[PDB]
């Protein structure tokens, strides 16, 4: 036969192992197809009616979650077009924490609706300009659809009613108990003048009975044991020592020098006398429990047990600081008796066990305090991980609501109203950007279609009914869930409320990712190492 050579210019010097995609067909269309294939994977797991997914990484682990962030993190994608969407989802999760699958679906719909425009003739510049104009219009009309605000933030009968919508979307069925637990944990740790921290909530997984057996704890817990024999302590005076409970020595290498027999006979005696004196002086201040953070000794433990002093040993470089901030005490780098202002007043320090696991419970009788600890009970590690992720999502939603007390009607009425307003505004826009505006308005219909596909009803009829309801006059009417017949239902009367700043940031990041993907022309890669 006959073989064709290479291009004498750039293909010969391209070097083997690398690739080149200068044409728009082998680059832009390939990235669009890859993004569509990525969006078609995590599309059935979006709404509350969506199923879960069991993903196994290369570490021979088990991850049966439902959020799109964990799925994108435990996937290892070898494609830049999908890597950009993964990075955008990670940034959205780091910023807000409740808008990854929505961003992915929006980006996929935008790319799918821009591919046909690029095919029929719309260039990248006009499409990008139209998308930016539509995004600016949506960001300008978005603050006009609030009509819902949060009153008090410390009321237990109001916080649990707001995060229930976000909890039901992740854990369908058992949501009221989780919402009440999250509200109680947020109330017990709510300080003053705002400033809500996300590290003040500790989650503990204990294999026990069912889910209804779980409860909250006003304090901290540790999965350790007691070094001494003292267990039940009433009025406990915690004295945390950052230094190890042992005899302090010199940093420089130095030995002891002895000559006569008197020193050899009195060295151990003087050492024991000094140790006993230090132990008596430490316990003279009224301390009932000593929490160390290093290696303990035998003589020190014996002297502490002789004077009935509880010893707690733990090393984590974080739990000690958490306990000090909870009990209100400071760490001492030396074995010196603390002052009255450096004492840790508690309520009840005992050692019990739940689910065949010894744990030290530091329950406090105060309603306020500092931080708390949520104890989880279950029979599977995947269920406990899912409950912990739902609790973290609820905490993030509460933090977002505290930062911004503006609410928007959830479900699918807000997207339909935004699409209708964009279509009505783009009708009086001359030029070639009207097609891009109408395409951007059509991308908002991907959320109700996905919801109807996950529920099990006709998406076209639901969209038509929603459009008719929005044209009639009602604006806070979404799609019903507890009905096999495709109908409509009010979202304000039911209580389907979601955050506004989170959705705004999600839309902004989705538009940014879309324009960044559209701005990519040719692809130049190398060889894998």
């Amino acid at each position: 036969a006959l073989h064709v050579p290479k291009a004498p210019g750039f293909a010969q010097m391209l070097k083997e192992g690398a690739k080149h995609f200068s044409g728009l067909e082998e680059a832009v269309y390939r990235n669009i197809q890859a993004c569509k294939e990525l969006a078609q994977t995590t599309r059935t797991a979006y709404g509350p009616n969506g199923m879960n997914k069991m993903v196994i990484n290369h570490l021979e682990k088990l991850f049966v979650t439902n959020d799109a962030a964990t799925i994108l993190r435990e996937l290892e994608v070898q494609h830049p077009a999908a890597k950009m969407i993964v990075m955008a989802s990670h940034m959205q999760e780091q910023e807000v924490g409740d808008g990854t699958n929505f961003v992915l679906v929006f980006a996929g719909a935008l790319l799918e609706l821009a591919e046909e425009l690029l095919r029929i003739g719309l260039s990248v510049s006009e499409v990008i300009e139209g998308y930016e104009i539509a995004c600016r219009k949506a960001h300008e009309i978005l603050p006009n659809l609030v009509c819902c605000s949060a009153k008090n933030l410390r009321d237990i009968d109001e916080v649990s009613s707001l995060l229930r919508t976000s909890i039901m979307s992740k854990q369908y069925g058992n949501e009221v108990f989780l919402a009440k637990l999250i509200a109680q944990a947020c109330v017990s740790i709510f300080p003053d003048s705002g400033h809500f921290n996300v590290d003040n909530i500790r989650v503990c997984k204990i294999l026990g009975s069912g889910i209804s057996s779980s409860s909250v704890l006003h304090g901290m817990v540790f999965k350790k044991e007691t070094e001494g024999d003292v267990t039940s302590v009433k009025d406990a005076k915690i004295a945390v020592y950052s230094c190890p409970f042992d005899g302090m020595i010199t940093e420089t290498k130095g030995t002891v020098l002895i000559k006569t027999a008197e020193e050899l006979m009195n060295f151990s005696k003087g050492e024991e006398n000094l140790m006993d004196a230090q132990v008596k002086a430490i316990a003279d201040t009224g301390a009932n429990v000593v929490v160390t953070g290093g290696k303990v000794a035998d003589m020190a433990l014996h002297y502490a047990n002789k004077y009935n002093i509880m010893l707690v040993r733990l090393n984590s470089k974080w739990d000690l600081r958490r306990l000090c901030k909870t009990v209100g005490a400071t760490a001492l780098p030396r074995l010196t008796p603390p002052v009255l202002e450096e004492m840790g007043h508690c309520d009840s320090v005992y050692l019990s066990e739940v689910g065949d696991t010894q744990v030290v419970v530091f329950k406090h009788e105060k309603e306020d305090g500092a931080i708390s600890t949520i104890v989880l009970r279950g029979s599977t590690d995947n269920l406990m991980d899912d409950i912990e992720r739902a609790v973290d999502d609820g905490v993030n939603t509460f933090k977002v609501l505290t930062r911004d007390k503006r609410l928007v009607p959830g479900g699918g009425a807000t997207e339909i109203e935004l699409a209708k307003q964009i279509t009505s505004y783009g009708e009086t826009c001359p030029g070639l950007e009207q097609y891009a505006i109408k395409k951007f308005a059509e991308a908002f219909e991907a959320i109700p279609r996905a919801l109807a596909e996950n529920s099990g009803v006709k998406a076209n009829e639901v969209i038509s009914k929603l459009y008719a309801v929005h044209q009639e006059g009602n604006k806070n009417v979404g799609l019903d869930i507890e009905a096999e017949v495709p109908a409509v239902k009010d979202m304000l009367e039911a209580g389907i409320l979601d955050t506004y700043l989170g959705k705004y940031w999600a839309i902004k990041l989705a538009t940014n990712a879309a324009v960044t993907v559209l701005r990519v022309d040719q692809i130049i890669m190398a060889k894998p190492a």
Partner: protein, 527 residues
């Protein structure tokens, strides 16, 4: 070749054809990065890193090409970049066009010496014309703003470009002087991963990458004093090997207290200095150290409300000395209060695992800090490269007492001058002069090709408009009509263009005088 059979060697025609093909291949690739209407590139490394940039120096290095001519071109581009600044893509394009014009006349029965002699005279005439075509202005704020806008227009979009231009102009005016030249290594480039909108402004102060270590320290401090030092505060051992020889526990405790008294004395001295400086409780005290600090000193200084830092770089001390105005002392001998700095608002910012410190509100700062913000890493790198290019362009425009209009009117004027000076050269250098004049018109052709209009008709119209009226009629990138480059606000540089022309002439002279590629080196393979 008979002595070493395992050695490839090219002749006079083969090596010349290989060099011409390599130049054409390198020119046909970098021809899509000229002007703001270019296309973006997506580079993927072997590990999985994505880089979105538009500069030619990065593309010439991230292309994976093994060739001697390509390596020389990349080295020349990197030299031009790290010596002047923006001037790599146009340099490569001009080099390729000159090599093509030389090869067009070489394969007709000519000697490259005549072409080189003609190119020398053409470069001399171009330099003589550029020495008189430059325009000298007062270099006010509007001129620098326009220069930065023209330099940053071919990077991002419009709003971010204007924001970066304003930030660069403000930083340059803040670090501006009247007797000392424009010194670099003063503006810290800090990157962030949030707020990719209108947030890349200028910070009048300094932003570090490390905060406080003691949790009991104050977070937001109002009016405080800055103490710059680099003395060691840890357990420093002696140079000679020593050892303790105690007897009982009392001697051990005494030797333990003795080795810590050396640091306790310095702690007490710092406490006394702070008490003498302050006295009441309406002021603070900030200590900036370059080495580490032991936890004992951190706990001792936390009782007096001191927010000290540890482990810093060397440029941070110079930046603080230039901004606040203190003395970067090394020992605590003559600890006078006059060797301190003045602050206004110091607050610690936390971004998850990282921790930064903001030192703003100063009296007369001389070292600012640009806070870069981006969504990912590729956008951050692109914004940083654009800011660096804009700063280099502003520095080059300030160091020179003249300005040069951009667009493509200068190239057309140089081509017209070379055409008018073509019959005034004796010998066979007329062909070389014509080739040099036709090679300089590659910038308007590429600009018209990237804009979306005709090339030959546009060049003819530009030449007619330049010949019918002695003006700096540039080339428009929106409607294709002959517009004035000095009327809109398109400005370039003179020294940069001179260095580019010199490098192009040197490369042409070095390539046209080489016609032998031999590889008779050691294989370094034993087995």
């Amino acid at each position: 070749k008979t002595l070493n059979p395992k050695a490839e060697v090219a002749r006079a025609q083969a090596a010349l054809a290989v060099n011409i093909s390599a130049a054409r291949g390198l020119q046909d690739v970098l021809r899509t990065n000229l002007g703001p209407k270019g296309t973006m590139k997506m580079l993927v490394s072997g590990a999985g890193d994505i880089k979105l940039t538009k500069d030619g120096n990065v593309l010439l290095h991230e292309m994976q090409i093994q060739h001697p001519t390509a390596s020389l071109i990349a080295k020349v581009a990197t030299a031009q970049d790290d010596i002047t600044g923006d001037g790599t893509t146009s340099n490569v394009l001009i080099i390729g066009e000159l090599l093509k014009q030389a090869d067009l006349y070489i394969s007709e029965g000519l000697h490259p010496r005549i072409i080189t002699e003609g190119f020398e005279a053409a470069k001399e005439k171009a330099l003589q014309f550029l020495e008189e075509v430059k325009v000298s202005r007062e270099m006010d704020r509007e001129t620098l703003i326009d220069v930065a806008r023209t330099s940053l227009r071919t990077k991002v979009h419009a709003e971010l470009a204007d924001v970066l231009t304003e930030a660069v102009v403000d930083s340059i005016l803040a670090i501006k002087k009247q007797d000392e030249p424009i010194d670099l290594f003063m503006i810290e480039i800090m990157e962030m991963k949030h707020k990719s909108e209108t947030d890349t402004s200028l910070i009048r102060g300094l932003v570090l990458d490390h905060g406080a270590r003691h949790p009991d320290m104050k977070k937001r401090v109002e009016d405080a004093y800055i103490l710059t030092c680099n003395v060691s505060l840890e357990y420093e051992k002696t140079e000679v090997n020593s050892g303790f020889f105690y007897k009982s526990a009392e001697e051990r405790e005494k030797l333990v207290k003795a080795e810590r008294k050396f640091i306790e004395d310095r702690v007490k001295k710092i406490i006394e200095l702070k008490r003498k400086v302050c006295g009441d409780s309406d002021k603070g005290f900030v200590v900036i150290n370059q080495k580490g600090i032991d936890p004992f000193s951190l706990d001792a200084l936390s009782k007096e409300g001191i927010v000290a830092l540890r482990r810093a770089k060397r440029r941070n001390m110079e930046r603080l000395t230039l901004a606040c105005g203190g003395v970067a002392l090394n020992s605590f001998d003559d600890l006078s209060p006059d060797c301190l700095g003045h602050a206004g608002l110091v607050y610690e910012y936390t971004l998850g695992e990282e921790k930064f410190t903001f030192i703003e509100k100063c009296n007369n700062p001389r070292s600012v800090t640009l806070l870069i913000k981006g969504p990912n890493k590729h956008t951050l790198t692109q914004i940083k490269d654009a800011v660096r290019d804009g700063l280099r362009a502003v520095k080059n425009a300030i160091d020179d007492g003249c300005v040069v209009p951009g667009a493509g009117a200068v190239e057309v004027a140089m081509a017209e001058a070379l055409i008018k000076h073509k019959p005034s050269v004796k010998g066979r250098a007329q062909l070389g002069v014509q080739a040099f004049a036709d090679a300089l018109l590659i910038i308007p052709k590429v600009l018209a090709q990237n804009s979306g209009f005709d090339l030959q008709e546009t060049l003819v119209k530009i030449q007619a408009e330049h010949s019918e009226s002695g003006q700096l009629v540039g080339v428009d990138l929106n409607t294709g009509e002959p517009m004035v480059a000095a009327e809109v606000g398109v400005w370039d540089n003179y020294c940069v263009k001179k260095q580019l022309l010199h490098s192009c002439t040197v490369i042409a002279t070095n390539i046209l005088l080489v016609d032998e590629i031999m590889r008779a080196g050691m294989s370094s393979l034993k087995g």
